[PDB]
Amino acid sequence: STGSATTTPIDSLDDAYITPVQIGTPAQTLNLDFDTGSSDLWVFSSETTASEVDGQTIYTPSKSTTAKLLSGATWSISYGDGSSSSGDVYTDTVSVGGLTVTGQAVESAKKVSSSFTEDSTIDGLLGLAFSTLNTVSPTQQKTFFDNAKASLDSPVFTADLGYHAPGTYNFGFIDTTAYTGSITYTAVSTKQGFWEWTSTGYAVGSGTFKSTSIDGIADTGTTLLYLPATVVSAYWAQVSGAKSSSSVGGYVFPCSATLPSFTFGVGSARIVIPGDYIDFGPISTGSSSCFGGIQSSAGIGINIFGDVALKAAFVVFNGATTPTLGFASK
Template structure:
């Protein structure tokens, strides 16, 4: 979520997948660019809170108070407060829904499996500038009788609604009977991000939350029509990147792609990293020589790693300290953190230190929040955007069993 605050919890319905109308023509490949969220103002504690809530972890007392005091998780008189710490995501992707097309900017989230949107079925007080899907204005919308969705959040709030099938187009590729989950109720955390109109999940369909029958993701619905049943993330540092479907664009990476097996049993793109170290090349110091499991999650901004790894890393960062009020490690903004390197099979991926200097936590701009924080309480590590931006990443389901590919970026 990106990202997006307090998103989908990991518990979900795993009933048989719904049968959808097949794509009748081979579409081959397509690419979709991200667009910059004009309201984005990075705030590390808010992004950490978002990640914890997404995976059902109770916020530490200091972090909970910080986000509450900043009014990131509140509304005032029916409208979201605009603060320098607005809790939203940096990049969104345009998606067309319905006939005629209604364009909504969605967060592509490999950590969830629902395509849900703000809709005209929401109370007026729950909408804060978001574009709303109006099923009544789409000639191709069909209500899925008896279907509903109800997503629970780690802070006890939830979002829910009913379900339609409708024409959905991403990057020029259309699926005519995609499940579109229309929100009738959304939590305050989503209301505060006026530019984000919903999520498009890219995890595995087994954790889609529609009941009584789970629905397929957009990718699973179109996979058989692609040249290759794979999609790639080429996320960028401080600029919009691209998602490609059906093609592995050789111009976007250098050297070889290193593939590693994915455990999809929990519905996520889960894999085992082989090591972690601080620095790169001959100047690196091993932080963890054995493997640790994690998921590749485009919907989470920060990278969350084992507590022992994070503690050892920040011992190498000048002026770093654990700030319980902010909920994580901070350091002077003038500090350039060392690189962080993790292993994938026999390859290494290096997160540049500048990525780890995420954003100031105070108005003076003197103290900055680390882009790497602890995964304590989650049960696995989260390779969010801070990590994914360091590589060209392939989400591949073309070989019968899923796998993740990692390669050095071409630029």
């Protein structure tokens, strides 16, 4: 089997991407944030505290003939941005882009934090990291990918995120029309439950490439590119008037600037992030200070190749017995 679904930016900045997902029988279509940095499929639901729902589409298990309570199971998750959610668990039929999994754990939110409530466009998350990170207790549950894997034509999914445009998540096949050149594969460590890999270095603009190992994660659920402070300082030093602002919470730059590209290494290959991808616009409406898309990881504990980086590539998440990541230009 295969599946193919379009993923759409939630706003003009590409702050996140939503992908329609069919849950239950008859189908209830929710727009979920596919997150390669977490491992829970959770949704706004008929159980979510009413004051914490503001425009989201909800899953109502009582209207699904295939929903079953997963008796005794709870979940609770906290993300890198300080957001959180928790609740109970149903199993149900879940389809993505024509690929169906029966018996998928659908984590129904009873509570969500303010950032989820305030984002009316995101009806929940679909985690695509390793199932060792799934938070369901007392019986950990599998991701949609892990449940689909044995049925897929190839044990892979691909992320093809757009810049200010829709893109695609594919499951079970590699669309050889979706990228240019060849795919460079690189080793993955699953030790922390992430798609964790080591970039071979970077360049700023037209500058020379610096060969240096940067361990980090491929995380579709993170907007920006978070890298070591040395790398980030080297980038922003090439933008007149850029500075790190403790009041704003990262590097800002004059909105009048033209940003340089940023290159990262994948083995001997190179992915170029155009400068425009690194512009996240005014810090507040009408400001002439703009927020940067490359930020320091120093206060995180891990480097994150978030959407800023991933949207410059066609990315293969290879879930074979020995997992690997692949990157191609496009």
